[PDB]
């Protein structure tokens, strides 16, 4: 199974409990897939992407950071936690 086309590498977790993504996450993503599919050109401008989370953060409002801070930290720590006893005691 080592063919051009599927590279041997992280593509995914099948070996992880069930979880979905966190609002940190998901903001992050959302921005970047949306800056990429109305903006390809700058796609590969890591550092232009980075700003704008950073920026977008920094000048964010309460209104959509009371939730998405909540949910980002509850999530995060869910999972953290989760996946942490799991995987120290996954592979038995």
């Known amino acids: 199974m080592a063919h051009h086309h599927h590279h041997h590498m992280k593509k ?3 070996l992880a409990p069930k979880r979905a993504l966190s ?3 998901f903001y992050v ?3 970047r897939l949306e800056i990429i599919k109305e903006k390809p050109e ?3 401008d890591v550092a232009q992407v980075g700003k704008l989370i950073g920026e977008a953060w920094g ?3 309460p209104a959509q950071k009371a939730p998405y801070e909540k949910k980002a930290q509850l999530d995060k720590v ?3 936690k ?3 006893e799991y995987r120290k005691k996954n592979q038995e």
């Open 12 to 14: 995914k977790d099948p």
């Open 23 to 25: 609002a940190y996450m």
């Open 29 to 31: 993503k959302d921005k």
């Open 42 to 44: 700058l796609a590969k």
């Open 59 to 61: 000048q964010l409002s």
């Open 78 to 80: 869910r999972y953290s």
């Open 82 to 84: 989760e996946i942490e």
